[PDB]
Structure 1
């Protein structure tokens, strides 16, 4: 099994097997909430459409696709012992928030993800990345995974848009996997969660298959009441499959 090069909350690595079991075949996989890309990186679709609301993420991805070697050589130079400290971290974090260059931004982004508190990605109300230092053993520079993602990106387009736009690019030959921010037990609202299910209803009536993952709750069974439901163990994870 291939690992993602970012640490990402909701990273769906711990349950590929369950997803792969239930995820139908097609020519093209559309992921409206790509995040770290673990589904993408452990399937064999002919092509991929991959999207996210997070503009820094998509921009990193385009860079990794188109400037692989340039990027990896630059990003390795921050994974040295001199940098594992609060003083350097806040220095890098301020550079990132002030920089207007996409490439240097993306070099810093990977450092921020591997050196900051729990690999979180967060922003204050001014749009500034605002995760503090994570105080870590020795962070792993993920070279192998970066090369694996670049190689694999040659069959993908990445877009920065909301789930309703990227789900509209799906067609007769596509499959759609949705992994939205989890339901509760700013950000992503209950209206959108219900909207997501509705869009999925539209796609299955057009013979496009859709699979959604989420927690198992009263609200998730309400929204996905038209899918086939599968419960999965670890609270409980739900998989909702709309097969035409």
Structure 2
């Protein structure tokens, strides 16, 4: 398995094998909620369309893809011993929330991901990144994973859009994998949870396959009723809409 250079909520690898197991074959793979990229990094599709509502995440990715070397250097500089204390963490966080330069924010973003509390990515109502210091003993600088990501991203495209817009890019050779925010065991609402299933129902009729991942609850079985369901031992459900 290829680790993702970022720390993202949930953890896709913790189910990775079973996903490749029901993931239809095809030319292009479409991930409406790319996330940390666990699925992307661990598959061999010809092309990739990766999207996410988080702008900071996509900016980062496009940069890692286009300016891999330049980045890795600037990034590496922040993982020295001189920056491993709350004192600095809150300084870099502030520099980030105030920055207007895409590149500088992409660098700080990684540092925040690694030195921040539980590697969370959260913002307050003002739109500022508001995660606290994680007090980690020795943060790991993902240099190996950055490059691997960068190399594989050469056959990928990153978009910053909602799930509906990205899934609307899938063609006959495309195959859709959806990893939306987990169901109840702004924010991703129940109304949208259903809208996604509704869209899946739509694509599958155009003969475009779609695989959805989510908890296994009364609500998920309800939304994904029109799909071959397979439980994975709260549990984990995989919904497959096969043409």
Q: TM-score, normalised by structure 1?
A: 0.99
Greater CA drift, 95-104 or 10-19: 10-19
Deviations 1:183-211 (A, max 9, x none): 01131000000000000000001110000
Question: What RMSD, in angstroms, separates the aligned Cα atoms of the two structures?
Answer: 0.5
CA contact (8 A) 1:74 1:107 kept: yes
CA contact (8 A) 1:84 1:115 kept: yes
Shift of 1:15: 1.2
Name the counterpart of 1:22: 22
Shift of 1:137: 1.6
Is the partner of 1:175 in helix, strand or coil? strand
User: Are 1:236 and 2:235 an aligned pair?
Assistant: yes
CA contact (8 A) 1:11 1:35 kept: no
Give the distance between the partners of 2:102 and 2:23, measured in 1 at CA: 34
Shift of 1:11: 2.5
Deviations 1:6-37 (A, max 9, x none): 00002301111100000010000000000100
Give the distance between the partners of 2:126 and 2:7, measured in 1 at CA: 24
Shift of 1:115: 0.4
Structure 1 segments of 4 or more deviating over 6 A? none
Unpaired runs of at least 5, structure 1? none
User: Are 1:125 and 2:125 an aligned pair?
Assistant: yes
Deviations 1:46-75 (A, max 9, x none): 000000000000000000000000000110
Give the distance between the partners of 1:236 and 1:216, measured in 2 at CA: 6
Give the distance between the partners of 1:191 and 1:224, measured in 2 at CA: 14
Deviations 1:82-120 (A, max 9, x none): 111000000000000001000000000000000001000
Across the two proteins, how many residue pairs are aligned to each other? 243
Shift of 1:242: 0.3
Q: TM-score, normalised by structure 2?
A: 0.99
Unpaired runs of at least 5, structure 2? none
CA contact (8 A) 1:178 1:211 kept: yes
Name the counterpart of 1:85: 85
